[PDB]
Amino acid sequence: MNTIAWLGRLVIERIRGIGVAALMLLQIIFSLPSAGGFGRFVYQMHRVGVMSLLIITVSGLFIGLVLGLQGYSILVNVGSESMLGTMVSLTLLRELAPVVAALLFAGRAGSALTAEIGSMKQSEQLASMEMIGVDPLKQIVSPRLWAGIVSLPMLTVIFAAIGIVGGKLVGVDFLGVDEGSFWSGMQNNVQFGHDVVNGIIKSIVFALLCTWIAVFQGYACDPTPEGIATAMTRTVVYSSLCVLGFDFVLTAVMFG
Amino acid sequence: MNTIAWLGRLVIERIRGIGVAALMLLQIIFSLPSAGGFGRFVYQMHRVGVMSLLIITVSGLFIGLVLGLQGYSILVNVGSESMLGTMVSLTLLRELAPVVAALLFAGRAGSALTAEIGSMKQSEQLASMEMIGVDPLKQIVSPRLWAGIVSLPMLTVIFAAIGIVGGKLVGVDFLGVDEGSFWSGMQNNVQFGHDVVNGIIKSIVFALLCTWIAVFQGYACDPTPEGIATAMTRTVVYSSLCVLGFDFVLTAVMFG
Amino acid sequence: TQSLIEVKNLSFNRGERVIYDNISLNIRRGQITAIMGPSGTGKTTLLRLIGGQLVPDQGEVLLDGKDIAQMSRQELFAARARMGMLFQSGALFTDMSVYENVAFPIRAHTKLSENLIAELVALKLESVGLRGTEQLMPTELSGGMNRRVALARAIALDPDLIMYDEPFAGQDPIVKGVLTRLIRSLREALDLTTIIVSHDVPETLSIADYIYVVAEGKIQGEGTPEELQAYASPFVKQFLTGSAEGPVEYQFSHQAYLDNEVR
Amino acid sequence: TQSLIEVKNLSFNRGERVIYDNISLNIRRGQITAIMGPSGTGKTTLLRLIGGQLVPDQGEVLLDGKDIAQMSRQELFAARARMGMLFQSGALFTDMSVYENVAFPIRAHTKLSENLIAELVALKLESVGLRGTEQLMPTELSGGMNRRVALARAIALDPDLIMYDEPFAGQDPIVKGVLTRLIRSLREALDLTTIIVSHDVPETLSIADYIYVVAEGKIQGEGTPEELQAYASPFVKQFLTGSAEGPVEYQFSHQAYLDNEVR
Amino acid sequence: VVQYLNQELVVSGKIDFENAEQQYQAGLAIIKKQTSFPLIVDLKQLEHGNTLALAVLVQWLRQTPQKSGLHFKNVPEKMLKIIQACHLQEDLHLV
Ligand SMILES: CCCCCC/C=C/CCCCCCCCCC(=O)O[C@H](COC(=O)CCCCCCCCCCCCCCC)COP(=O)(O)OC[C@@H](O)CO
Ligand SMILES: CCCCCC/C=C/CCCCCCCCCC(=O)O[C@H](COC(=O)CCCCCCCCCCCCCCC)COP(=O)(O)OC[C@@H](O)CO
Ligand SMILES: CCCCCC/C=C\CCCCCCCCCC(=O)O[C@H](COC(=O)CCCCCCCCCCCCCCC)COP(=O)(O)OC[C@@H](O)CO
Ligand SMILES: CCCCCC/C=C\CCCCCCCCCC(=O)O[C@H](COC(=O)CCCCCCCCCCCCCCC)COP(=O)(O)OC[C@@H](O)CO
Ligand SMILES: CCCCCC/C=C\CCCCCCCCCC(=O)O[C@H](COC(=O)CCCCCCCCCCCCCCC)COP(=O)(O)OC[C@@H](O)CO
Ligand SMILES: CCCCCC/C=C\CCCCCCCCCC(=O)O[C@H](COC(=O)CCCCCCCCCCCCCCC)COP(=O)(O)OC[C@@H](O)CO
């Protein structure tokens, strides 16, 4: 039992890692605000939010193009091509725009947060800030956490808006369905509180998980040049399993 | 025009980067095999393929659980709950299993290939191997490229198989549809050559793009500890845009 | 022999690796104290215990009689206003330019006006020799000058203890020359008390006043650089000379090479 | 004065940074040749041009009359069997173990049996002093011993030219002592020709026989370590000693501090 | 305990960035109403001058007739060690 002991030692250190990351989160969100902390938050909205705007916009257009092309082939055989705008908008708003925009946020803006905090730990800027008398959990970590909780629900709304515009462009303007029936069938079956707000509630839960993992792995890193790179691929794996895992739980409550 | 000149200089170096990566690929696949090269390929099938087996298996089960739960709610209102196995298997086999398994391969096995090759470049093992008289494109790069082209189409077949098993588990065993009508409606509408083989042809195109990007960014890296980490987030962004971009082109040919 | 920092019987461990088994050190005021030793060990972990970032396991570090481990959040914040530390790479905060690097510890322990902060920064940067370089980033600073901006930040609050870890390393004799003129000049101008943790023997003995030599868990020798060599153990000799005779072994273990089957 | 490598009028550039403007070097056989200079430059890029990994821009490097740039794929592969190079970190192939690191250049230029390869590796590792350590990985090798496995790999084919870049750096005087005994001993036992690229002045002058000093684009001084100091330019002086008097400036540029408005 | 007028200003006490804002401001109000500026600052009664006592002295020199217009009396031997450490050994006027 040489590897069986190695396997059991592995999952104990991972259980203990969730305990450190839980106490690290309660120390950030339960503390008083300080001086100059809003301006550090607006700077990190540029690095997390605005830098992710180009991958999110082009990926939302490409997904709406496939939905309008595949959804026309199903509906035209049952005489319901007027329900194309209903199925395009309801597939994005409740399934695809919360989930796919959280898998591209964990790859771009999540893995770049655990490389920036991790190279501050290697070059000893976090130990130099602490010996001056400034907590690096408040100065460095806390603006980066709040900038990810705000930027991902702002980016799935832009994801869903171009997905519907991209699906209208292939459906109405190329395959030739009626434009007035596209929007009227959408305004009839899509509700705001049950379909649009329930997609924002999903992406706030995903933004908390994708950013708390990305911030923890850079802080509790191994300050060694291939200990940082091992941590960057842990935030892409752990965030993708948590996004797909919490997605089944949230649809069974909201739409079950 | 100070930033306009910076923007134009940016997209010229990216155009020139595709030219280096094209000539690098033609030098790998058009060369003779050598001694001891099969055993290096079986070692890299362990690092790329077997290490990715746990994220792929659990993510395929979670996605099939959502498909069987959402697809029951649509079909039960039109009296077609017997078509649940047809829509679960045809959503995975032609759309979701090639695409979502390529977004988790670019994050785990793609970003770990550009960190391993990039730290060989920083610690000067690639320059030390070249001055001995061994080409590092054949010794190091070429086993890693072929192990990714083989392992991703082997991993979307396992992705689609557990997605159907996961969708049968929520549909038949919890929501209570007939088991014999689940499999008989699936064996009637799903063809092998048009639906199963067309999903494998997609994942071979995606495995070439996801691995050629991951291998190039580690070889043409910047041997500096935050020049490696900048390269690891370039293989997740460039592979995700190429997977979603080539997915629209392949469905318009296969299913259009 | 009035001691500012005084260490008494501490023990540290990092992954079952022994660092500082049982060791007592006296850091006298107004004097350069060096701690030499072989590399690969945890030589810089004492400066992490003095400023207070790690906790010892069976020890107490005394700053003027007060222990640093048993010390609340408003005594530790006030103790760190008397200490500066220059790390080896000169740990400058990337995004911040040279002006708000030097003014970072000022704005943490002050409520000062903007016109007096800009006069402290201009006098600290010029006492190092870097007056004109205030508005440019830490990148493109010709990295032998990164360690001079980081010396102004480590001195801005006018402390009474400054800690250098490895200031003499793979550096030019020109760059190593500027630092040895600056370490001696800044501690007569400000009456400091320095601790240098290094292993550059020909440079350390010409700048220090009391050398400790720590091999694996304890002191192997101490004293003035004149009397350290005269009362030398048969470890301090090899270390301070680099000879073949001593306790460390040049061969791997012990064999005769005609005793193993090769293959 | 028979020269093995002979450099004639080359020029290199890396992002509009001048390295080797117009410089000619003679590497005589059977002698240690050192190339000292200030850091931050491209000092190690000459060894990348001798072995052949970069291409010069207006120059030709002559290996026994033959130019390395104008040289086909079967002359360059046969030229690299006469050269070894020990990098600064000792660039060992991770997953490989001490046995197949040393046997890597053997299996590239040979068709030898397994029982003679295992005798060459056991004699190369023992001539360095590492006989018992053959089956364990490069990780957990106590990194002053990583540079001794990498010296056995750099010497396995019994070359006639071996190149070290920065063997004297931030190392212990014990670890630096083993290498200085090994550099002198291995070149009388094998009749080598060494090139050392370093900036450790007190260690290099005691081991070299002809020093070149390259400041920004050209030689600032050359000769025996006795005659280099006696015919010294007013750059080799400051550099060789680290004094304040010379062309490099300790102040930033030039001011009087009562000429600028601060804020 | 900080400074009077006394027909040329006598800097007294100790400047340690907890009171070092009024001691700049109250000393500045003398410089506002001074005529012809030959006045000499009397650094007589300091005891802990350290790089901030100098930081308020240069701030008084910038608001003066010309760039100088200000002399200094005898220095408590700790402060002029920091004058030459900041290379101001020949930039001010010391009698
Ligand atoms: C037949 C009935 C038809 C439905 C009628 C509803 C009509 C539509 C109107 C409004 C939509 C209501 C639908 C339910 C809403 C789901 C609420 C929910 O899912 O709650 C979420 C819990 O998520 C998590 O923990 C993941 C944990 C999930 C388990 C939580 C269990 C929820 C139980 C209470 C919810 C009551 C449901 C009311 C609906 C009938 C919290 O979301 P946030 O506010 O963003 O908190 C931010 C987080 O970071 C927490 O700090
Ligand atoms: C009304 C008709 C109904 C359909 C009847 C078909 C019945 C089903 C039976 C069989 C399925 C045939 C469907 C078409 C198959 C698509 C072929 C394809 O898409 O070809 C792919 C091209 O992909 C790329 O370049 C991305 C480039 C894409 C552009 C390629 C354009 C294809 C044009 C030729 C294909 C003929 C289509 C025949 C179908 C009518 C190549 O795939 P691989 O072999 O993996 O090559 C590996 C790559 O790395 C190349 O090195
Ligand atoms: C239901 C109750 C509310 C829901 C939240 C529930 C979660 C639990 C409670 C959370 C709130 C508790 C209040 C305490 C917050 C603690 C975090 C904090 O206080 O962080 C602060 C940052 O400012 C900051 O609020 C970051 C600045 C503001 C961030 C948010 C900005 C809001 C703007 C978008 C709001 C969306 C509304 C739009 C609707 C369409 C302080 O950080 P620093 O200044 O950099 O520290 C540095 C120094 O200490 C040392 O250098
Ligand atoms: C009703 C429906 C609702 C929908 C609403 C509309 C949706 C949004 C619309 C449009 C959004 C466009 C996205 C804009 C992206 C802005 C990115 C940005 O603005 O980031 C800039 C860089 O972007 C950069 O890399 C340059 C980034 C790469 C440049 C792109 C190059 C690819 C394009 C060229 C090829 C043409 C495409 C081929 C077509 C055939 C910032 O520069 P930095 O130096 O990094 O930071 C500087 C800071 O330190 C201080 O300033
Ligand atoms: C339509 C035509 C075929 C489709 C391909 C089209 C693409 C273009 C042509 C490709 C084939 C050209 C043949 C040349 C291949 C060049 C690559 C190569 O030759 O790589 C070799 C690796 O072996 C190797 O084939 C890697 C060893 C084998 C890899 C593949 C293993 C196949 C097993 C799975 C096959 C799936 C079949 C299952 C069906 C259900 C050599 O590498 P090294 O030995 O490490 O070098 C090291 C030394 O030089 C110095 O140290
Ligand atoms: C008909 C339908 C068709 C379907 C077919 C069936 C589908 C496949 C079925 C099952 C696939 C299971 C996946 C097995 C994963 C194998 C991974 C593996 O085997 O990798 C190992 C490590 O895995 C490791 O990290 C250990 C990895 C993490 C351990 C997992 C810990 C999480 C589980 C504990 C928590 C319980 C779950 C909670 C439930 C309530 C290898 O060890 P290494 O040291 O890294 O390498 C060693 C090498 O140098 C030489 O050996």
Short mmCIF file of N, CA and C in Angstrom, two decimals, chain A residues 240-241 244, chain B residues 54-64 100 104 159:
data_model
loop_
_atom_site.label_atom_id
_atom_site.label_comp_id
_atom_site.label_asym_id
_atom_site.label_seq_id
_atom_site.Cartn_x
_atom_site.Cartn_y
_atom_site.Cartn_z
N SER A 240 -13.75 25.13 -13.66
CA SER A 240 -14.62 24.50 -14.65
C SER A 240 -15.46 23.39 -14.03
N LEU A 241 -14.92 22.68 -13.05
CA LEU A 241 -15.71 21.67 -12.36
C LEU A 241 -16.74 22.29 -11.44
N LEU A 244 -19.70 23.79 -13.86
CA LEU A 244 -20.60 22.76 -14.37
C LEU A 244 -21.30 22.01 -13.24
N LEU B 54 -9.81 12.77 -15.59
CA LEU B 54 -10.69 12.99 -14.46
C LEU B 54 -11.52 14.25 -14.63
N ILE B 55 -10.99 15.28 -15.28
CA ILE B 55 -11.81 16.45 -15.55
C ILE B 55 -12.83 16.15 -16.64
N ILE B 56 -12.48 15.28 -17.60
CA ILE B 56 -13.36 15.01 -18.73
C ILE B 56 -14.52 14.11 -18.31
N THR B 57 -14.27 13.16 -17.42
CA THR B 57 -15.30 12.21 -17.00
C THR B 57 -16.35 12.88 -16.13
N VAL B 58 -15.92 13.72 -15.18
CA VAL B 58 -16.88 14.35 -14.29
C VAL B 58 -17.62 15.48 -14.99
N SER B 59 -16.98 16.17 -15.93
CA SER B 59 -17.68 17.24 -16.64
C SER B 59 -18.66 16.70 -17.65
N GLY B 60 -18.42 15.51 -18.19
CA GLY B 60 -19.38 14.92 -19.10
C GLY B 60 -20.61 14.42 -18.39
N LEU B 61 -20.46 13.96 -17.15
CA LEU B 61 -21.60 13.50 -16.38
C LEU B 61 -22.49 14.66 -15.96
N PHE B 62 -21.88 15.78 -15.57
CA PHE B 62 -22.65 16.94 -15.13
C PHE B 62 -23.41 17.59 -16.27
N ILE B 63 -22.90 17.50 -17.49
CA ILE B 63 -23.57 18.12 -18.62
C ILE B 63 -24.72 17.26 -19.11
N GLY B 64 -24.55 15.94 -19.08
CA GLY B 64 -25.65 15.05 -19.40
C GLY B 64 -26.78 15.09 -18.39
N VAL B 100 -17.28 21.32 -25.91
CA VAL B 100 -16.98 21.51 -24.49
C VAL B 100 -15.77 20.68 -24.07
N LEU B 104 -12.10 22.31 -22.30
CA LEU B 104 -11.43 21.83 -21.11
C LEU B 104 -10.08 21.21 -21.41
N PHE B 159 -16.43 11.45 -23.39
CA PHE B 159 -17.30 12.54 -22.96
C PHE B 159 -18.74 12.29 -23.38
#
